[PDB]
Design a protein around this ligand. Structure first.
Ligand SMILES: *[C@@H]1O[C@H](CO)[C@@H](O)[C@H](O)[C@H]1NC(C)=O
Ligand SMILES: *[C@@H]1O[C@H](CO)[C@@H](O)[C@H](O)[C@H]1NC(C)=O
Lengths: 563, 235
């Protein structure tokens, strides 16, 4: 070049770029690459107005600066203007982002760093970890100087012994008084624990209702709303028997059980269909050990290779599969306790701010079916809707927790051969299972996956993929998928091999994971499927909700017919 | 077949796909002769009607050599009890003659003394079948094979909450997720010796598929070689 001593020493980028000015071709030769030189020149351009002094240029080289829009920002900053930690950009929690990973990768988003997908005027932003704010703009300092481009309680036993006086719910609906005439009548209707109080419109729980703290709200007399509050997290596997006392040695497969069921509702308040759950009219009323898929636990010679290869008709008599007046599809998966009531999820009904195209005339039900086409009178029954009630722990700004709801049908309560509820007794035999290690199964049909993720190059299967996710310790759920787990939030899974489609997530919401017990003959349910991170995405743990916290409000639902 | 890779065309000829009423393999099959198929006797509790589609290489579609064969009668062990975990073996005499061709060649019995002195004394063993590609992953669309090593008796005993009888032996990995799984119901697991694969056994039960600390509970073929022959000549 200009100096002959330059060519005497072999090419080292320092001597051309720091000592003097390096052009495109000289920096290309010294760097032995074109894309690297282009990226270096872009980071160089980041300090076009900030090249002086040199530490400012070094700050541009490391980055951490986004003035103006910030879509080209590729730095390392977590702090927002408010100061809240940003949600993991790779993850999609705690809400549904309309900027999905398959539409706008233009942000170059990274889990630990802020980016700007929409090129916001204020700068790169992020969704807040906490549900207080929908999204917080990432306040990023300017290169070279310490200035920013844009200016900077748990409830005991789910309300059994709670004394909070909060009134506003998460969505915004005000609560009705617990002392109202309808609420006073419901006080006699629902057996309350003697050592609990209920006053005004506070989220109470006098009956041991493990739904968390919920308040009677306006509209339907008895409609329930949840005050916006945080809740703790617990673990179960760490305890051995305790007062359980069932056996001395260990045995996991090969157990038979026969017994009765203890109810939690007044028989006058629930009528027929109360003390018969957890069984099947065909398979379990005769109390006979049934075919291949349930044989996995009961067969002594078989614990890992059974593989019936099919899920014949009626294997899930207590699962619901919705239609809308839209082209035939399931909005939110659901399970059946009885023909009259369907336990749908609350996410689909009330996501948009306008709150429309989710109405009663749209939704239709069919239950206990291998495929969504075939139907007969004695298999299940269909009826119109009158009013749908939503969960006041959900909105477009909230964290989507406790996504469960119901639907008020017309024709009265009835059962069938392919219709039977599932029982939910206490933790005694659950501990027996935990210290005995028994296996279970989950059901569904596989359309909620289609609603939350899209399939390309392969049609959506109309048949449930009958593959099981066993019970795994809670931390495995916590680190496999990164959606926060509430107190009403269940977890399960297996030691996975990534890269393939979710094994039991092929299914719908509300898919009961039912699991055999040695003292009841009624296979136990532990989780109701909800919005899943690894479910709605590829090959990770599907989410459930704690059924132990979803088992007390059903009593008063049938009486509105008789009111 | 947790993990693993596809059987190359002809690599697993005795391996058969026991097609049930819906013609999807409810069990792993093993060609034995021109008229015989091998499966674990647990497969007898999972059947409405069933056939043997020998030569199948892909459950997605027919891709050559698929001949449908119908089981004449099952030779179930009379001492076969699920609780014993033992005699989980069902010889399937066929109505349709097995046509020895590409991907059709059985595995026959070696010397009982030599088999005991050599087969169960090997290092690793090869398992094949349209099995679950992972511990719970989807069933292998292609005919996928896998190799698993032998496990010491005491290791299997401590690794099992149940009995590890004089025959049953563990084979797999302590924590690595690779073994037979759902799809290898009676799925033929073999062992190479001078390119002649020898069926050293088939998983019966176990906690999960290649779980942590767990192994496939295989059946000692050398234990019942005399019974295997006597059931070859039975029915
Ligand atoms: C940002 O947060 C991540 C956690 O994902 C942490 O590892 C990283 O050090 C943080 N970086 C900055 C610049 O705050
Ligand atoms: C339902 O949503 C569609 C969008 O496809 C809209 O055009 C229609 O008006 C909606 N129905 C209403 C608002 O009643």
């Amino acid at each position: 070049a200009n100096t002959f001593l330059e060519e005497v020493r072999k090419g080292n980028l320092e001597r051309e770029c720091v000592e003097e000015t390096c052009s495109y071709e000289e920096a290309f030769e010294a760097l032995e690459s074109s894309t690297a030189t282009d990226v270096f020149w872009a980071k160089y351009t980041a300090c076009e107005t900030a090249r002086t002094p040199r530490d400012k240029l070094a700050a541009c080289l490391e980055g951490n600066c986004a003035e103006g829009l910030g879509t080209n920002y590729r730095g390392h900053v977590n702090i927002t203007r408010s100061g809240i930690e940003c949600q993991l950009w790779r993850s999609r929690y705690p809400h549904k982002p309309e900027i999905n990973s398959t539409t706008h990768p233009g942000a170059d988003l990274q889990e630990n760093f802020c980016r700007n997908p929409d090129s916001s005027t204020t700068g790169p932003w992020c969704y807040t970890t906490d549900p207080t704010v929908r999204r917080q703009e990432c306040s990023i300092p300017v290169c070279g100087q310490d200035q920013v481009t844009v200016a900077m309680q748990c409830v005991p036993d789910r309300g059994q012994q709670y004394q909070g006086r909060l009134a506003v719910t998460t969505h915004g609906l005000p609560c009705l008084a617990w002392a109202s005439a309808q609420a006073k009548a419901l006080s006699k209707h629902q057996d309350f624990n003697s050592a609990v109080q209920l006053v005004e419109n506070f989220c109470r729980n006098p009956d041991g209702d493990e739904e968390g703290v919920w308040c009677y709200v306006a509209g339907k007399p008895g409609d329930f709303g949840y005050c916006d509050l945080n809740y703790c997290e617990e673990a179960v596997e760490e305890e051995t028997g305790d007062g359980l006392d069932e056996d001395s040695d260990r045995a996991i497969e090969g157990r038979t059980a026969t017994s009765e069921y203890q109810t939690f509702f007044n028989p006058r308040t629930f009528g027929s269909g109360e003390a018969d759950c957890g069984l099947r009219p065909l398979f379990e009323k005769k109390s006979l050990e049934d075919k291949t898929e349930r044989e996995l636990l009961e067969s002594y010679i078989d614990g890992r290779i059974v593989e019936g290869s099919d899920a014949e008709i009626g294997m899930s008599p207590w699962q619901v599969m919705l239609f809308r007046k839209s082209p035939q599809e399931l909005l939110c998966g659901a399970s059946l306790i009885s023909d009259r009531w369907v336990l749908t999820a609350a996410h689909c009904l009330l996501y948009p701010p306008w709150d429309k195209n989710f109405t009663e005339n749209d939704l239709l039900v069919r239950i206990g079916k291998h495929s969504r086409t075939r139907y007969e009178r004695n298999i299940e029954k269909i009826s119109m809707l009158e009013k749908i009630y939503i969960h006041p722990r959900y909105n477009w700004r909230e964290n989507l927790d406790r996504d469960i709801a119901l639907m008020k049908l017309k024709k009265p309560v009835a059962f069938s051969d392919y219709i039977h509820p599932v029982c939910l007794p206490d933790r005694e035999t659950a501990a027996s299972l935990l210290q005995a290690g028994y296996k279970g199964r989950v059901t569904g049909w596989g359309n909620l996956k289609e609603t939350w993720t899209a399939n390309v190059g392969k049609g959506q299967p109309s048949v449930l993929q009958v593959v099981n996710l066993p019970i795994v310790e809670r931390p495995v759920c916590k680190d496999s998928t990164r959606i926060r787990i509430t107190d009403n939030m269940f977890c399960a899974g297996y030691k996975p091999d990534e890269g393939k489609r979710g094994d039991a997530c092929e299914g719908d919401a509300g898919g009961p994971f039912v699991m055999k017990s040695p003292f009841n003959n009624r296979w136990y349910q532990m989780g109701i499927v909800s919005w899943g991170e690894g479910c709605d995405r590829d090959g990770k743990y599907g989410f459930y909700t704690h059924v132990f916290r979803l088992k007390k409000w059903i009593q008063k639902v049938i009486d509105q017919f008789g009111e | 077949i947790v993990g693993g890779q596809e059987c190359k065309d002809g690599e697993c000829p005795w391996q058969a796909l026991l097609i049930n009423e819906e013609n999807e393999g409810f069990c792993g099959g093993t060609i034995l002769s021109e008229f015989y198929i091998l499966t674990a006797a647990h497969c007898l509790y999972q059947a409405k009607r069933f056939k043997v589609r020998v030569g199948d290489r892909n459950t997605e579609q027919e891709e050559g050599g698929e001949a449908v064969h119908e089981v004449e009668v099952v030779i179930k062990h009379n001492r076969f009890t699920k609780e014993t975990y033992d005699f989980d073996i069902a010889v399937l005499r066929l109505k349709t003659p097995i046509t020895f061709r590409m991907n059709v060649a059985p595995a026959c019995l070696p010397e009982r003394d030599w088999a005991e002195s050599t087969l169960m004394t090997q290092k690793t063993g090869i398992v094949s079948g349209f099995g679950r590609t992972h511990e719970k992953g989807r069933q292998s669309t292609r005919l996928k094979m896998l190799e698993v090593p032998y496990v010491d008796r005491n290791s299997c005993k401590l690794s099992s909450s149940f009995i590890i009888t004089q025959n049953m032996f563990c084979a797999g990995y302590d924590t690595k997720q690779e073994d037979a799984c759902q799809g290898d119901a009676g799925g033929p697991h073999v062992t190479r010796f001078k390119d002649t694969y020898f069926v050293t056994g088939i998983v019966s039960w176990g906690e999960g598929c290649a779980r942590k600390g767990k192994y496939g509970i295989y059946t000692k073929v050398t234990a019942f070689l005399k019974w295997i022959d006597r059931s070859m000549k039975t029915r």
